[PDB]
Each structure stands twice: as structure tokens, then as C-alpha cells.
Amino acid sequence: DDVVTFKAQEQLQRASEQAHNSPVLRALLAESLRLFEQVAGSLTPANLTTAVEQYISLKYYAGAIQLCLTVAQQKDRGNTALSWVNDGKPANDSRKKAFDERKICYNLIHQVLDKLESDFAGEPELVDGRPTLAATKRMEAYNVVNDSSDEVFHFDLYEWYIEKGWTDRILSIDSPHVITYLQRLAETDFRHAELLCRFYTTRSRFFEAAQVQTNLAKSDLNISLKDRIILLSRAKGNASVNTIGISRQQQQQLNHEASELLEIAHIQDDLLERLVADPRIPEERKAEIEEFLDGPIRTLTDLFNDYADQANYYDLCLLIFHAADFHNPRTILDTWNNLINQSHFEAEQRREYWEAPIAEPPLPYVYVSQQIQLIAHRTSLDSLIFPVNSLLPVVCAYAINNGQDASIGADPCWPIQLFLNLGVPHALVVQVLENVLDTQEAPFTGRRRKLVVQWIAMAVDMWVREVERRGAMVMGSWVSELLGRADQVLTQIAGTGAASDAEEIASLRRTVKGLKRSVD
């Protein structure tokens, strides 16, 4: 008797579906709606409510929405609620009637779209091979909403989508009325600028995203500095790739602005990062600092004076100079000398305490070498704040005046190895050691010039190694002129030394005269 049972379940399943298959209802309901839309502009809020309540009882969702939209438009046909919100919240106004009346209708639309999901909550989206009737009344409903020309309703709807946390709904909307809403809101709420930027990037309008991401870091909004760094770092990414329609010059114009601010913001961050963790600063001032630094990005003037220059943060002072295109060879160099000395000082401090130091601390020249590499890699070997013409001699002078050599087990040629490995051109290092070997300005005097030759011997050695591999054969007579002139220095030092290195010197001559052959 399973056959008789199926026919019993069939009639019941058909009885439930009946109310919707019926063409009488579809005709009655459509007729009641037609009559309401006639006197739409004269409906009392009490009647419009009762009507929507009854329409929902009968699963007439999409139609009830169309009544409320119609009563809205017909209560203010001149569209004053647009002129009200578009001008933006004119308080003490007669156009509060338009919005207040239109919203009584909009609140009912929300009621429908809520009861819509409730009745057909979790119900299936697709009958085997066909959409459900639940999904049809759903499709009918959200077609009325998204197609409407009443955009004040769309704004009130978008405000209510957000207030309900329906994020993915805003993004999925293909209307162009939503972008106007987010713009008016992104400028005063960070939570909304997030959407406007996420809307643009799904459309692949990356420039329009970086355009907002950048303008947000420059904002007066309560945003952390490290977040502002992210914004400017994403904007530089969104402004790195082509987007349909936008030029190359305006694209680079925005990438450059983002890169400028990002460079400062990293300085400001690394400054704030060090200032708070600096034991020399009073704990009371540190609270006043972070409130001033964390937040918007300040001028390089503010970063430099009240903080970086006082604390004698010579490394960040140089980074500020680079970011400010600060043309002054003296102050740039004076800061490099202080940076090296203060670095040598701290590193001799830690080694003395390790004689608290956690692990074997680094020798002075190692720590000084790190502090240089950090500025070389961060600023890309500028010709201004990294002037090899002056800085390399200073490092070579410090390597003598503070005895960072074989005496402590250090590579005597560590100042050359430092600049070569940093990317400095071989031809330039030798061009400096040439100037050091002749002038004989202290400390580069007397028998210590023996070490100047060592620097030249390896420098030129590291250069002939690079050209054999390079495949070339600027190096010329002038390098041979130097090695032969550097040979006289080794003999003039071998005589006045009559020293125990008399055999070390002799061994170097056999290396020099060999390099001269490789060049000639």
C-alpha cells in the first residue's frame, strides 16, 4: 500500500503549495496592491502598516516592498529628502517631514526583508533541477529593492545593511548609488573607508583604492601610525599595477606620494620605537611622546628637533637627512663621525661588562660595521649621506685610532671589505685609497701606511678578480702608477723600521708587484 500512501502525501504536499499556485490570490493580491498604489500619497501610516502586515501573512513580500516605495515617492515627489541628505543633515528644517515620513515606509521594508529570511530561513535554494518557490519569492523581493530609483531609500537601506553587519551584501551590489553613500561616510568613519576600498579592489579599480588608502593615512581620523604604514604600503601596491583607464604619470604621481610618506612613517615609527625603550628618557615624558608620535605622520622638522637630534640618535638623523634631501656635506659628515664614535663606545661598554651581556657581544668594529650597513641598505648608497669620498677615510682612520686590527683578531682590511661588499664600485674605493696613500694626513702617516697598502693590495686584488670573471680588458695606467708608487712606501717603511714585521713587509711587496703585472 505504498502507492496509496504516496498519493496521500501528494495531495497534502499539493495543498500546502496550493495557496501559491492559485491564480485567484495572485489576482486578488495584485488588485489590492493596484488600489493601494492609487491612494499611495494619502495613506496613513496606520493603514500602510496593517497592509504590509497582511501582505506578509500571505507571503506577498516583493509586492509589499513596492507599495512602501510607492507611498514614499508619492509623499515627497519633489524629492526633498534627497536635497536634505545631499546637503547633509540640515537641522531645524521643514524637510524633516519628507525624511521622517519616507522612513516610516522604509522601516516597513526592513520588516519585510527580515520576515522574508525568517519564513524561508535555511530553506533550500534549488529544488532538484529547479528553484524553490521560497527562492522565487526571495528573488522577486530583492529585485524590487535593488532596481528602485529612490536612492534616499538605498542610503537608508545601506545604513541598515551595515547596521546589521551584512558586509558581503554591500560589496555584491552592482548599483552605482552605493559608491556615493560610502564616499560621504568613508571621510568620517574608518570602518566605512574599509568598504569603499574593498569595493574598488573587487572591481580592480586599484588606483581608486590607493587614492583612498593614501588619503586616509593623511587624515585627521584616529588611526594608529603602524596601521597608517599598512595603508600607505598597500596603496603603493595598488598604485604599482595598471588599472583600466588611468594614466602612467598620475599612477606614478600617487606611488611617489605614498612612498614619500611611507619613508617618513618608518622613520617616525623607528624613532618612537627607540624613544620609549630608551633608559635615558624620563618615564613621564615617554607618555607625552607616544601620544604625539603615534597617530598622524608629523613633519621631518618635528621628528628631528624635539627628539632625534636631542637624543643624539645619529643614525636616524642621517635617515632624516636623506628623506629631506638635506644638502650639507659638513653636518652630514659630522654626524657620521659621532655615529661611529658613539657606536664604538657602546660596543666597548658591552665587551667590558662581559669580562648585562647575554651572549659574547660583538667587537667594536663589528658593531660599527652593522650600523653602517643598516644606513647603506636603508637609503640605497646615496651620494650625499653616504659620501665614500669622505666617509671611507673616516672609517679607515677609526680602524687605526681605536686599534681594530689583527691585534684583536680582526681582519685588518675590514674597512675595505665593508664598503666593497656594500656594493661600492671597486674603481672608487681604490680611487680613495690612492688619495689616502699620498696626502699622508694623520693618522695615515709613518709606518701605519703599511696598512694603507694592505687595503690597496686587497682592494685592487678584489678588482682584478671581478674583471677576469666580468670579461673586460676605469682601470688603466693610473692603477699601475699607484701600485709602483705604493711599492716605494713599503721600502721606505722597511728601512726606517730597522721592526719585527720586516718579513711581513717583504711578503707584501711580492703581492703588490704581482698585481702590477696583472694590470700592465
Binding site: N305, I320, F326
Partner: peptide, 17 residues
């Protein structure tokens, strides 16, 4: 741009009056 002004600053090593 950068503008050094060693004249009038705020003492970085003391709390405020």
C-alpha cells in the same frame, strides 16, 4: 622640507613644569 631650530625646543630629559 626640513628646518633645524636648536633655539626653542622642549627638554627631552625632564617632565613638564
Amino acid at each position: 622640507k626640513l628646518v633645524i631650530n636648536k633655539d626653542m625646543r622642549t627638554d627631552l630629559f625632564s617632565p613638564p613644569n
